[PDB]
């Protein structure tokens, strides 16, 4: 069924693509400097560096600053992925994607300054509560459905969906962060990347893959949210991989028959049977019985009352994040890896 609603979506996406392409072809560079920011506290870490809460001295606004050590990025062969991340993030604009406000680099590091999202990682809230009710999980899943509709329309694959990468804002809505493995590609791509529990079978089997991997991952996410544990787990990655390729899933006894039916279609090992990848595209998911009560337009416009609103005691509050050890930011007197990060 094509109707007026589907035509309005098509028109919105056409205009969004025009906007994206102007920024894609002419990316912003060097729009701030380190000493414009007061560093307050570390909010999170990774392999390339860390994320810190900072205050912009001229406006008094708080932001989350991601810092990447250029030498570590080279050592781990993530040069191209880091260039993809920044070029994509500065070009996108959607209600459920974190906004990149500034970017710059110095002799040692790359910096990306984003909006501060104070509600914490969905990961934290999920492990604490155990599991979300079906209506709670559906509210979040709808936001990711609309996000992947937007991203895929721009020829982007996201490739790292998991509760650790979803933050909850003050209104209880989701913001997707970490675009470290996002790529703009027409056609197939081949890199082995993502998180073991969330990897599609075609990635593991080295087959060449496309946007359908993101729809698999959404199946994994919905299961984990509704069960409290992922569908494929073990203590060692190789044991996880074995389970993923077998095509055997067990559902908890409390899953509704409609949830089970959606998940059998998202967790389809065979590419040409997987929801999101058939002729009706994303509409096979949006029209599924599990989503019959969902008002897609109201979700987009943020008019649905969220089931959970995190506690926030004033600007600058970090109580929804864990504590981490504070390291000094070292900036060398000589420039490192200048050629490699020329376009950043």
């Amino acid at each position: 069924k094509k109707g007026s609603e589907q035509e309005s979506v098509k028109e919105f996406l056409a205009k969004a693509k025009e906007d994206f392409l102007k920024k894609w072809e002419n990316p912003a560079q060097n729009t701030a400097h380190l000493d414009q920011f007061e560093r307050i506290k570390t909010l999170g870490t990774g392999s390339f560096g860390r994320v810190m809460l900072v205050k912009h001295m001229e406006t008094g606004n708080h932001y989350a600053m991601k810092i990447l050590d250029k030498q570590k990025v080279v050592k781990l062969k993530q040069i191209e992925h880091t260039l993809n991340e920044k070029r994509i993030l500065q070009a996108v604009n959607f209600p459920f994607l974190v906004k990149l406000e500034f970017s710059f680099k110095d002799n040692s590091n790359l910096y990306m300054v984003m909006e501060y999202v104070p509600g914490g990682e969905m990961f934290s809230h999920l492990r604490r509560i155990g599991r979300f009710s079906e209506p709670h999980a559906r509210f979040y899943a709808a936001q990711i459905v609309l996000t992947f509709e937007y991203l895929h329309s721009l020829d982007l694959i996201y490739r790292d969906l998991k509760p650790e990468n979803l933050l909850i804002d003050q209104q209880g809505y989701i913001q997707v962060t970490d675009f470290g493995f996002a790529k703009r590609v027409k056609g197939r791509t081949w890199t082995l990347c993502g998180t073991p529990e969330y990897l599609a079978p075609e990635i593991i089997l080295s087959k060449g893959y496309n946007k359908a991997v993101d729809w698999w991952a959404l199946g994994v996410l919905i299961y984990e949210m509704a069960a409290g544990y992922p569908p494929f787990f073990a203590d060692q990655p190789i044991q996880i991989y074995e389970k993923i390729v077998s095509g055997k899933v067990r559902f908890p006894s409390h899953f509704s028959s409609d949830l089970k039916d959606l998940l059998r279609n998202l967790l389809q090992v065979d590419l040409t049977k997987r929801f999101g990848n058939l002729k009706n595209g994303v509409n096979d998911i949006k029209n599924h019985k599990w989503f019959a009560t969902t008002d897609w337009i109201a979700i987009y416009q943020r008019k649905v009352e969220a089931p959970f609103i995190p506690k926030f005691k004033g600007p600058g509050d970090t109580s929804n994040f864990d504590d981490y050890e504070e390291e000094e930011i070292r900036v060398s007197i000589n420039e490192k890896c200048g050629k490699e990060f020329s376009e950043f």
Binding site: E164, G180, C193, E197, D235
Partner: peptide, 20 residues
């Protein structure tokens, strides 16, 4: 139960990405 098996497993914390 499966949930009890999960919470006693070695992967209940934040999961890092892998890469080539």
């Amino acid at each position: 139960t499966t949930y009890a098996d999960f919470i006693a497993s070695g992967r209940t914390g934040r999961r890092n990405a892998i890469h080539d």
